[PDB]
Design a protein around this ligand. Structure first.
Ligand SMILES: CC(C)(COP(=O)(O)OP(=O)(O)OC[C@H]1O[C@@H](n2cnc3c(N)ncnc32)[C@H](O)[C@@H]1OP(=O)(O)O)[C@@H](O)C(=O)NCCC(=O)NCCS
Ligand SMILES: CC(C)(COP(=O)(O)OP(=O)(O)OC[C@H]1O[C@@H](n2cnc3c(N)ncnc32)[C@H](O)[C@@H]1OP(=O)(O)O)[C@@H](O)C(=O)NCCC(=O)NCCS
Ligand SMILES: CC(C)(COP(=O)(O)OP(=O)(O)OC[C@H]1O[C@@H](n2cnc3c(N)ncnc32)[C@H](O)[C@@H]1OP(=O)(O)O)[C@@H](O)C(=O)NCCC(=O)NCCS
Ligand SMILES: CC(C)(COP(=O)(O)OP(=O)(O)OC[C@H]1O[C@@H](n2cnc3c(N)ncnc32)[C@H](O)[C@@H]1OP(=O)(O)O)[C@@H](O)C(=O)NCCC(=O)NCCS
Ligand SMILES: CC(C)(COP(=O)(O)OP(=O)(O)OC[C@H]1O[C@@H](n2cnc3c(N)ncnc32)[C@H](O)[C@@H]1OP(=O)(O)O)[C@@H](O)C(=O)NCCC(=O)NCCS
Ligand SMILES: CC(C)(COP(=O)(O)OP(=O)(O)OC[C@H]1O[C@@H](n2cnc3c(N)ncnc32)[C@H](O)[C@@H]1OP(=O)(O)O)[C@@H](O)C(=O)NCCC(=O)NCCS
Ligand SMILES: CC(C)(COP(=O)(O)OP(=O)(O)OC[C@H]1O[C@@H](n2cnc3c(N)ncnc32)[C@H](O)[C@@H]1OP(=O)(O)O)[C@@H](O)C(=O)NCCC(=O)NCCS
Ligand SMILES: CC(C)(COP(=O)(O)OP(=O)(O)OC[C@H]1O[C@@H](n2cnc3c(N)ncnc32)[C@H](O)[C@@H]1OP(=O)(O)O)[C@@H](O)C(=O)NCCC(=O)NCCS
Ligand SMILES: CC(C)(COP(=O)(O)OP(=O)(O)OC[C@H]1O[C@@H](n2cnc3c(N)ncnc32)[C@H](O)[C@@H]1OP(=O)(O)O)[C@@H](O)C(=O)NCCC(=O)NCCS
Ligand SMILES: CC(C)(COP(=O)(O)OP(=O)(O)OC[C@H]1O[C@@H](n2cnc3c(N)ncnc32)[C@H](O)[C@@H]1OP(=O)(O)O)[C@@H](O)C(=O)NCCC(=O)NCCS
Ligand SMILES: CC(C)(COP(=O)(O)OP(=O)(O)OC[C@H]1O[C@@H](n2cnc3c(N)ncnc32)[C@H](O)[C@@H]1OP(=O)(O)O)[C@@H](O)C(=O)NCCC(=O)NCCS
Ligand SMILES: CC(C)(COP(=O)(O)OP(=O)(O)OC[C@H]1O[C@@H](n2cnc3c(N)ncnc32)[C@H](O)[C@@H]1OP(=O)(O)O)[C@@H](O)C(=O)NCCC(=O)NCCS
Ligand SMILES: Cc1cc2nc3c(=O)[nH]c(=O)nc-3n(C[C@H](O)[C@H](O)[C@H](O)COP(=O)(O)O)c2cc1C
Ligand SMILES: Cc1cc2nc3c(=O)[nH]c(=O)nc-3n(C[C@H](O)[C@H](O)[C@H](O)COP(=O)(O)O)c2cc1C
Ligand SMILES: [Cl-]
Ligand SMILES: [Cl-]
Lengths: 68, 68, 67, 68, 67, 67, 68, 67, 67, 68, 67, 68
């Protein structure tokens, strides 16, 4: 009778992969409660002159639905 | 003309798989209208002393979007 | 040696998953011989006012071909 | 960095595949802002007396999340 | 209690993707009854001098089994 | 810090799917400690005169490794 | 224009993989006309005292449908 | 003992899917010889104010290697 | 009732694919009992001056767990 | 016939992804010999108040079997 | 440090699977240097009156890029 | 419209995952123009006495084709 929902977010960062994920979670945190877990679905990114411009990490974020 | 949306839910139950799915659908039903179909994506669970503690079924629920 | 064929069937039931599979196999059994094994490919279903209306299980049924 | 969300929509149309996609995006457009890209996940459809009755295209639509 | 079968067909057409699907369905329609839905599994094709010679769409066609 | 191992087991049962999963876990539990979670990878089975003879559920069982 | 059907067969042989495929095709050609191509989907087998007992190759066989 | 190569190209077009595929093949055709077949791997696109801005079709193009 | 385990092995051989599989099964046979079936998951290999140096077949081997 | 075995491990770490992998491999190396290569299968993690609590990386580790 | 490229080839042969792979590698080795490994992605073929006419093996060939 | 090509590279590095990606892009950048995006397909590596010897990241690099 616990139900969870998963939403698909993409985090981005110039710094690295961890930072990309943290960006997604940090935005999730602002409006969604009872965030429990995340799964990484894809890693992609953009390229510029210095190599990687932006890391982009597609993740599913699971959280418990409040009842009623 | 019709457009549907799919949301990803995870039902849980100590009783069985069917019970887990029904849990997800019961919760969806409280706030969503025109639920039409579901697809099971993963079946997993936690383990305790008596075996399966919790069945967890990841499912996509599809429903028809109302008009604007 | 022997050759098998696999057919793709979808069983449905209001009772449960097992009942869905059994319904597919009970229909296969009516016309096909030497049914050996099955594989579940998808589980889906329809929704009504009581929750699950119909469980739908898509399976591949393997059977030995007669020469 | 920026964060994006992906939602899973299913467009339908009697005309063709392109019209199915457009139907989804047209409905997205009514309530969502900063729609950026889409990915097609499945193509399916229903069958009637004249062949295809309805094309159905399951797509993920990605859009930029606004701040705060 | 209803059971469906799925058959795997490949439609081809020089015109386009829709026309390839319709071709598969038209041929199905000739001999099969209670065709309900289809799923597209692959899109491929052959190449000639003017580009696409033939669109080829692999689809699964599902239909209700009589009894 | 903590490291887990996953092992791939196949439970079987004539009764149903739940009973199959439990059979795997029950056998795991006899020799392995700190069983935490499982994932179902495939569902298959054998066919006899009465329909399903045996349900077979392939699962991955994860458990915490001791030091 | 032309429409093909794919059927899923499993060829078996104690000799090897090629022989398993050939067994499937040989049986196909006994009742099916206009066999064009095949795809290998899985390779499996049984084990005995001398190693492999039986190679089993699951293949899709494609053939051109005739007109009524 | 013929050998083929596959290259992965992405065609784009504002008009439709077919047009996107044709655009990739038209470019292929300029520099590559013995183009035989293609496979569509993904369909995606960009969104603008009028809906689809750009259809993008990722496809593998196969062609026979000369000696 | 019965429970099986699957272990993931990689056979190698310079001779061919069959020989690669057999090498994995011959080694399994040394220490494991009640080997029943195998599934090939990947086929890969290394390249040398004469072409294929080593065929590598990744397979899951299934066997019945004793009481 | 060299023969290799693959075992499926999950590494975890609060630091990052690299640290999670290294944890799995450090534990592997304590009891297993001739560790050759690894493949990452999934990246997931748990969420806490500061974002990522735990990175979890599922990997397959391949090693050469001795002989017996 | 090192960077590799993978190209996708399709070998064909009337003889067997092994000969199909060897053909792709033999052609690779004429123009490409530092060929290291290969992965088989698909196995297919064409059918004629004696059964298999042509085995076709899709493989990725990996090789180390020079300076 | 425009046409892009994707090429499949494998970047390696002893330092980490990011470094591996950057190595691939740095080598692409030497000879290819209009590099736009990348997709990570696999993460693997080799194992030595100190854990990870080499991180290996298989990625697809997309770039816009010039006009001929
Ligand atoms: C938070 C959440 C789980 C709560 O779900 P919930 O219990 O159903 O609450 P909701 O607000 O979604 O209620 C459903 C809404 O859709 C409407 N709705 C229900 N059926 C509908 C239908 N078929 N067609 C159109 N709208 C429908 C309901 O009327 C309700 O809207 P209302 O409040 O204006 O009346 C859900 O809204 C959610 O997951 N939001 C997205 C989270 C997210 O991704 N945020 C970004 C994080 S960075
Ligand atoms: C637009 C959107 C991105 C904004 O995300 P957001 O910043 O999280 O804003 P939301 O409206 O979803 O806010 C989260 C809501 O869920 C509630 N909520 C948060 N955690 C919850 C939980 N665990 N359980 C239940 N409810 C929860 C919040 O209270 C809030 O609802 P409230 O305003 O009634 O209090 C998001 O709402 C969304 O993606 N909507 C769906 C878009 C869509 O697919 N529309 C159809 C297009 S055709
Ligand atoms: C019901 C639903 C389909 C209706 O979709 P909708 O027509 O877009 O209605 P929404 O409420 O989602 O409208 C979009 C919202 O996102 C906001 N928004 C639009 N674009 C945005 C963007 N780029 N960034 C942030 N917010 C945005 C809109 O302002 C609007 O919120 P507002 O009313 O506060 O102004 C959708 O809200 C939904 O699927 N909800 C989740 C259902 C769910 O999972 N419930 C739990 C069931 S167990
Ligand atoms: C129409 C259909 C669903 C009906 O299925 P059904 O009830 O089993 O009817 P079938 O004709 O297939 O009956 C089984 C046949 O196989 C035979 N058979 C049964 N087991 C067998 C075995 N193990 N080995 C060989 N033959 C066997 C039966 O004897 C029977 O043949 P018979 O009437 O000559 O005695 C099924 O025949 C079908 O899906 N056909 C293909 C449809 C298709 O794809 N057409 C092209 C559309 S474009
Ligand atoms: C050969 C084949 C392509 C021809 O297809 P076809 O043009 O549709 O011809 P069919 O004989 O299958 O005709 C369809 C049959 O199903 C029946 N049928 C149609 N719809 C049905 C439905 N909804 N429910 C039950 N039966 C149905 C038709 O009445 C017809 O049977 P009938 O002649 O007794 O009236 C197809 O039968 C086939 O692929 N057979 C299997 C080939 C195979 O795998 N053989 C083994 C090789 S090793
Ligand atoms: C043969 C096999 C199926 C028997 O499994 P089993 O019934 O659990 O018997 P095991 O010997 O593995 O017993 C479990 C061991 O793990 C230990 N163990 C249990 N839980 C543990 C934990 N969480 N952390 C660390 N160790 C644990 C037990 O103490 C026992 O070890 P011990 O005998 O040193 O005390 C199993 O050992 C196996 O599949 N082996 C690998 C086969 C293989 O791949 N060989 C190569 C073929 S080429
Ligand atoms: C039972 C079965 C394995 C027997 O296969 P088989 O040995 O090839 O025998 P078939 O009856 O299929 O013979 C092939 C038929 O297709 C026809 N056929 C062969 N090549 C054809 C072609 N290229 N185009 C159209 N028809 C063709 C043959 O003429 C023959 O039909 P006919 O007897 O009317 O002349 C096969 O028919 C089958 O799998 N049927 C479907 C089983 C099923 O799903 N039943 C439903 C279970 S609930
Ligand atoms: C056409 C094609 C199949 C011919 O392949 P080929 O027979 O090997 O011919 P190539 O020109 O590629 O020869 C290999 C080149 O790589 C070089 N090379 C070989 N090994 C190398 C290595 N390990 N590291 C770096 N370069 C190497 C060779 O020196 C040669 O270059 P060079 O002529 O400057 O000395 C191949 O070049 C190709 O598929 N090109 C891309 C097609 C394409 O996608 N075009 C866009 C269509 S829209
Ligand atoms: C740069 C690139 C996009 C340009 O593609 P293009 O427009 O086709 O230009 P190409 O040089 O490849 O032209 C095709 C070549 O293949 C030859 N060719 C065409 N068809 C052929 C066939 N069927 N068999 C053998 N060769 C063929 C052409 O003759 C031409 O070679 P030539 O100039 O010696 O006459 C393409 O060459 C490419 O993607 N190269 C690889 C990029 C790469 O991965 N580099 C490493 C980065 S780390
Ligand atoms: C190291 C390893 C490759 C050696 O495999 P091996 O050559 O088969 O050696 P094993 O010890 O496993 O021998 C097989 C065992 O299973 C038993 N056995 C064989 N068949 C069996 C069966 N069908 N049912 C139950 N037990 C069986 C054998 O009796 C033997 O145990 P015993 O020594 O008590 O008699 C293997 O044990 C292994 O991969 N271990 C796990 C490594 C691992 O993941 N460690 C954690 C790293 S972090
Ligand atoms: C329990 C377990 C996690 C403990 O792993 P561990 O810490 O590595 O302990 P192990 O017993 O496997 O130790 C590794 C063994 O492999 C041997 N070994 C190490 N590298 C080897 C190699 N490359 N080749 C052959 N043998 C090797 C070691 O010498 C040791 O055997 P030994 O005690 O006879 O000297 C592991 O053994 C396991 O997962 N067992 C299988 C559990 C299982 O599936 N049981 C059935 C449940 S129903
Ligand atoms: C050998 C190889 C690795 C060397 O890669 P490289 O270091 O980039 O060398 P390239 O020839 O590809 O150099 C890039 C070329 O593309 C051109 N180019 C770069 N960006 C481009 C763009 N955006 N649009 C069009 N052309 C472009 C460059 O100008 C250069 O061509 P040029 O020498 O005529 O000026 C690469 O060419 C390759 O893998 N070739 C294919 C190998 C193959 O499959 N052969 C068949 C084996 S059976
Ligand atoms: C992409 C998609 C997938 C569907 N999958 C199923 C299915 O799994 N099983 C089923 O019975 N119906 C399925 N349907 C049909 C729907 O459940 C439903 O009957 C149909 O969309 C009509 O919806 P509406 O009456 O609300 O307009 C699917 C429909 C779509 C659009
Ligand atoms: C991503 C990738 C995948 C590889 N897969 C295999 C494998 O399938 N089997 C194998 O024996 N070697 C495999 N290798 C190892 C390489 O082929 C080779 O042994 C190693 O990269 C040394 O090459 P180098 O000397 O050119 O640097 C793989 C290497 C990489 C980079
Ligand atoms: Cl959502
Ligand atoms: Cl290339």
């Amino acid at each position: 009778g616990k139900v969870y929902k998963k939403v698909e977010l993409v985090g981005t960062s110039e710094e690295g992969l961890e930072a990309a994920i943290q960006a997604a979670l940090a935005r999730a945190r602002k409006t969604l409660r009872h965030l429990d877990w995340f799964e990484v679905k894809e890693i992609a990114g953009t390229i510029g002159e210095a190599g990687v411009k932006e890391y982009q990490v597609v993740l599913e974020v699971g959280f418990r639905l409040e009842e009623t």
